[PDB]
Every structure is written in structure tokens, then in C-alpha cells.
């Protein structure tokens, strides 16, 4: 669920 | 930007829009006339960078520039370990001419102070789930290292710091990556990541801790 705040988000939990 | 408001037009003249195929995917921050700092996770093989904007449509913004860039320098230890060292330098194809609406910002030499109220700006998601027409500004509070670690262990790393998580639900969100967090008038951080969804009470977002990288930045600029 740790997601970057780009479009689209890059999600790593 | 969640629960912010329109920035005063051109009050954040270092703000850079990273667009490709006419759509924003990140921001960056002008730190020297030929150099835009952004998050390494915003890396692409080439860029079109909008400077001097308020709305994202350059043809509606006097004084704005859409500059091309092909070269960027990711921090060599970006993502090793995961999410750490989230910065890159984009070299503009040519230096901008700094103006009333396009200006570089000084980078913080000193590290973030817990409790500081710092400004974040961007064109990312609003509280209502839409994208704004104009650049948004909000303030968020720097959180102690202790609390940041509790929330983000074991991925927390000193190249990161936390800000936000207030009852006010003020935060940065999708599309704000790579944009500025300003403390004491200095560029303190870049928008990096958080726990989805943005704006959770007690769950601050994470920012690239630029005080750790001032030497690497200038080394890159000078080489």
C-alpha cells in the first residue's frame, strides 16, 4: 500500500 | 493537493510540470536555470517541462515555457533500498531565462524541524477526486523521525521525512510527486509517497529529504 504520488501511482502494503 | 486552495498566481515560480503526450504525470522543481529536481520514480526517457504555469495550458499562460529535456540523472542508489533516495536531476535542453514567473529556489542545507509548517504545491488530486485547473497550495506539518519510523518501518530511511497526517487531512496526492515542500522559504523536500489513500488522519506522507543530497546535487550540476 506504499504508493508513489505519480500518475499513475507506483505501488510497492 | 488534498484540502488546499489555489496558489497565488506565480507565487511558486520554481514549480515545473512534467508532462508527456499532453498529460501531467509529476511535477519538479527548478533549482538552477538548466536543472529541474524531481522524484526518481518520475523518471522517463524524455520530458516536456512546463515552467511559469498556473493553469497547465501554456498557451493560456503569458511568460510560460514548455522546455524539452532528454537527459536525467537518477540518484544512483534510488530504490536501493526500496523507496529510498527518491530524487533525480533533469537537465533541460537549454537553460531557462529566469523571470518574474520562472525562478530557481535554494535547497535547504539544514534538515527538517519537527513541527514546522511547510508549503506543498501541485496539480495532483483534490479532496473531491478531481484534478484542479490551477496550481494548488497547502501547508503540512513535519512529523518527528520517531513517528515516521513507526508508520513506515522497515522501509523508512533517513533519505525520507514525514509531513502531514493532521486532523485537517491536508496532504499531497497523485500527480503531486516530484513537487516542492518548502520550509522556512527553502526547498526542504520533494513529494515522494504515502499510504493510500492520501489524507488519512495520523498517516503523514513521505518526502525526499533533500538536506541529505545537497552535495550530490551540486556535484551532478557541476560535472
Author numbering:
A (entry chain B): 1 to 12, 14
B (entry chain A): 16 to 38, 40 to 67, 69 to 74, 74A, 75 to 125, 127 to 130, 132 to 147, 150 to 186, ...
Sentences from the paper on this structure:
The kallikrein (KLK) gene family is the largest protease gene cluster in the human genome and encodes 15 serine proteases that have sequence identity varying from 40–80%, with a high degree of structural similarity around the active site1. KLK4 is predominantly expressed in basal and secretory cells of the prostate gland with lower levels of expression in a number of tissues including breast, ovaries, thyroid, testis and developing teeth. Over-expression of KLK4 has been documented in malignant prostate, ovarian and breast tumors and is associated with metastasis, and mechanisms underpinning resistance to androgen deprivation therapy. In order to investigate further both direct and indirect mechanisms of KLK4 inhibition here we describe the structures of KLK4 in complex with SFTI-1, an engineered SFTI-1 variant, and with nickel (KLK4-Ni).
To examine the interaction between KLK4 and inhibitor we determined the X-ray crystal structure of a KLK4-SFTI-1 complex to 1.0 Å resolution. The inhibitor structure is well-resolved except for missing density in the backbone of Pro13 and the side chain of Asp14. The contact β-sheet of SFTI-1 has multiple interactions with the KLK4 active site, including the P1 Lys5 inserting into the S1 pocket of KLK4. Interface interactions are dominated by only 4 SFTI-1 residues: P1 Lys5, P4 Arg2, P2′ Ile7, and Phe12. SFTI-1 engages in 10 H-bonds and 2 salt bridges with KLK4. The P1 residue Lys5 is the anchor residue since it engages in 4 H-bonds and 2 salt bridges, with its side-chain engaging in 1 out of 5 H-bonds and both salt bridges. To enable the hydrophobic environment of the S4 pocket to accommodate the positively charged P4 Arg, both loop VI Leu175 and the adjacent helix Leu171 shift, accompanied by recruitment of a water molecule that makes bridging H-bonds between P4 Arg and Tyr172 (loop VI). Outside of the P4-P2′ residues, Phe12 which contributes 12% of the SFTI-1 buried surface area, induces changes in the conformations of loop IV. SFTI-1 has less buried surface area and fewer interactions with KLK4 than with either trypsin or matriptase. In contrast, KLK4 undergoes significant conformational change at the P4/S4 site to accommodate SFTI-1.
